[PDB]
């Protein structure tokens, strides 16, 4: 569906030597995630002669030309963003023989919401652990921001956790969200780094409720009035007033009066020090 994937015996994509990875240094494995976002499998990559575990995205066997365009586009965007510890990094691509493969870092523990929820108490998710989670995501957003990247969908479901409990921001939209959207984004479809800061506030609340759902009991069509009327979430039980103070600053109606990601990193770093 239709002309490029049906008509071509081979897809003559341009060779980019900086990123091309040999297909025979790759051992494809088990599917990864629930497949909302294309086909992604776990794999072993050799010499990234030590293996290492990676994630590999490819086209579903019924993909359309539009899915082809989206994967290439995602791939091209990730080449320009550059690497950072707290984001899902591009590791390589396979474009020259056979199937298009996009190789990404694997985060073995899944997404941050589920990680938190699984380790809820009846400890594991101590204050220092939660602050560390927040801090790492803020560092990743600070980086993304410095590359002029606006996420637009920052949420704990979109932060992946590696084997070493490193936070890695994923992004499935490089090519439901309403409870994470800044008022300017809801009402006027305006997206800025400051609207990401608002989302980060919602993520902070997610962290300190141990994977709780935002605005419990409130239907998405009402968030509408509520946010305009100045409604904000309350303090999570597992949360010092000072961290709640940060959340609340992130939900300022005025984008200029929300902290910057640089500020959030410095404040969270200081809390971490105090342990």
Which residue numbers are catalytic? 153
Residue facing ligand 37O at closest CB distance: 33
Residue 253's region, left for phi above 0, alpha for psi from -120 to 50, else beta, is alpha
The DSSP string of 144-166 is HHHTT---S---GGGEEE-TT--
Q: Does 91 bind ligand 37O (CB under 6 A)?
A: no
CB of 95 to ligand 37O, least distance (A): 14
Contact mark string toward ligand 37O, 116..155, x via CB under 6 A: ----------------------------------------
37 near ligand 37O (CB under 6 A): yes
Is 38 annotated as ligand-binding? yes
Residue 39 in contact with residue 28, Cβ under 8 Å?
no
Residue 59 as a binder of ligand 37O (CB under 6 A): the answer is no
35 annotated as a binding-site residue = yes
Q: For ligand 37O, which is the closer residue by CB, 102 or 233?
A: 102
Per CB under 6 A, 32 contacts ligand 37O? yes
CA 203 to chain centroid: 11
- Should residue 55 be labelled a site residue for ligand 37O when binding is judged by CB under 6 A? yes
In this structure, are residues 49 and 68 in contact, taking their beta carbons and an 8 Å threshold?
A: no
Query: Per rule CB under 6 A, is residue 196 in the interface with ligand 37O?
Result: no
Residue among 256, 241, 159, 147 at smallest CA distance from 200: 159
CB of 51 to ligand 37O, least distance (A): 16
* Residue 70 touching ligand 37O (CB under 6 A): no
Backbone angles phi, psi at 107, to 5 degrees: -115, 100
Decide if residue 36 touches ligand 37O (CB under 6 A).
Answer: yes
User: Is 176 near ligand 37O (CB under 6 A)?
Assistant: no
- Strand ranges (DSSP E) for 124-273? 159-161, 167-169
DSSP state of 164: T
Judged by CB under 6 A, the residue of 29, 33, 240, 255 near ligand 37O is 33
CB 7: neighbour CB atoms within 10 A? 8
Among 141, 142, 171, 183, binds ligand 37O (CB under 6 A): 171
How many other β-carbons are positioned within 10 Å of the β-carbon of residue 111? 20
How far is Cα 117 from Cα 177, in angstroms, rounded to an integer?
A: 19
Query: DSSP 3-state assignment of 12?
Result: coil
Q: Which residues, 6+ apart, have CB-to-CB distance to 14 below 8 Å?
A: 95
| Count of residues touching ligand 37O (by CB under 6 A) | 21
Q: Is 21 annotated as a binding residue?
A: no
Question: Residue positions in the annotated binding site for ATP?
Answer: 32-40, 57
What residues make contact with ligand 37O under the rule CB under 6 A?
32-37, 40, 55, 57, 74, 88, 102, 104, 106-108, 110, 160, 170-171, 174
């Amino acid at each position: 569906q239709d002309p490029l994937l049906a008509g071509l015996v081979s897809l003559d994509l341009p060779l980019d030597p900086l990123w091309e990875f040999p297909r025979d240094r790759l051992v494809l494995g088990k599917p990864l995630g629930e497949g909302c976002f294309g086909q992604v499998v776990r794999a072993e990559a050799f010499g990234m002669d030590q293996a290492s575990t990676v994630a590999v995205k490819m086209l579903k066997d019924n993909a359309s030309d539009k899915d082809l365009a989206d994967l290439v586009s995602e791939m091209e965007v990730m080449k320009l963003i550059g690497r950072h510890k707290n984001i899902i990094n591009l590791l390589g691509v396979c474009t020259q023989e056979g199937p298009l493969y996009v190789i990404l870092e694997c985060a073995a523990k899944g997404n941050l919401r589920e990680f938190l929820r699984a380790r809820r108490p009846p400890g594991p998710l101590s204050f220092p652990v939660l602050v560390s989670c927040a801090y790492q995501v803020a560092r990743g957003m600070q980086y993304l921001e410095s590359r002029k990247c606006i996420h637009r969908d920052l949420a704990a479901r979109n932060v992946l956790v590696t084997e070493d409990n490193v936070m890695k921001i994923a992004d499935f939209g490089l090519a439901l969200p309403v409870k994470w959207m800044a008022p300017e984004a809801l009402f006027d479809e305006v997206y800025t780094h400051q609207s990401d800061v608002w989302s980060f506030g919602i993520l902070l609340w997610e962290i300190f409720t141990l994977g709780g759902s935002p605005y419990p009991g409130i239907p998405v069509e009402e968030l509408f009035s509520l946010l305009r009327e100045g409604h904000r979430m309350d303090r999570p039980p597992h949360c010092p007033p000072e961290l709640y103070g940060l959340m609340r600053e992130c939900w300022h109606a005025a984008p200029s009066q929300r902290p910057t990601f640089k500020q959030l990193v410095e404040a969270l770093d200081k809390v971490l020090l105090a342990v």
